[PDB]
């Protein structure tokens, strides 16, 4: 699933570099639907929120 993979991967980068990247990425692709997930308007928005914290804790399963 693309949506979960981009969520998981974007969350990973924002988890390492900090939430300062969430803002950058969100505003850098605000019109692009590939990043619509970063806004609360998307259904998986809540899923991504968890991924960030999870990658920071270093417990989640990286993608394949």
From Swiss-Prot:
Tissue specificity field: Ubiquitously expressed.
Task: Tell me where in this chain the PTM N6-acetyllysine is found.
Answer: 9
In which domain of life is the source organism classified?
Eukaryota
The SURP motif repeat ranges on this chain: 6-48
Localization of this protein? Nucleus; Nucleus speckle
Q: In the UniProt entry, what is the domain comment?
A: SURP motif 2 mediates direct binding to SF3A3.
- Tell me how this protein assembles: Component of the 17S U2 SnRNP complex, a ribonucleoprotein complex that contains small nuclear RNA (snRNA) U2 and a number of specific proteins. Part of the SF3A subcomplex of the 17S U2 SnRNP complex which is composed of three subunits; SF3A3/SAP61, SF3A2/SAP62 and SF3A1/SAP114. SF3A associates with the splicing factor SF3B and a 12S RNA unit to form the mature 17S U2 small nuclear ribonucleoprotein complex (17S U2 snRNP). SF3A1 functions as a scaffold that interacts directly with both SF3A2 and SF3A3. Identified in the spliceosome 'E' complex, a precursor of the spliceosome 'A' complex.
Provide the function of this protein. Component of the 17S U2 SnRNP complex of the spliceosome, a large ribonucleoprotein complex that removes introns from transcribed pre-mRNAs. The 17S U2 SnRNP complex (1) directly participates in early spliceosome assembly and (2) mediates recognition of the intron branch site during pre-mRNA splicing by promoting the selection of the pre-mRNA branch-site adenosine, the nucleophile for the first step of splicing.
The molecule here is called: Splicing factor 3A subunit 1
Which gene is annotated as encoding this protein in its UniProt record?
A: SF3A1
């Amino acid at each position: 699933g693309e949506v979960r993979n981009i969520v998981d991967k974007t969350a990973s980068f924002v988890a390492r570099n900090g939430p300062e990247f969430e803002a950058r990425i969100r505003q850098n692709e605000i019109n692009n639907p590939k990043f619509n997930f970063l806004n609360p308007n998307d259904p998986y928005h809540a899923y991504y929120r968890h991924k960030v914290s999870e990658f920071k804790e270093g417990k989640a399963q990286e993608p394949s």
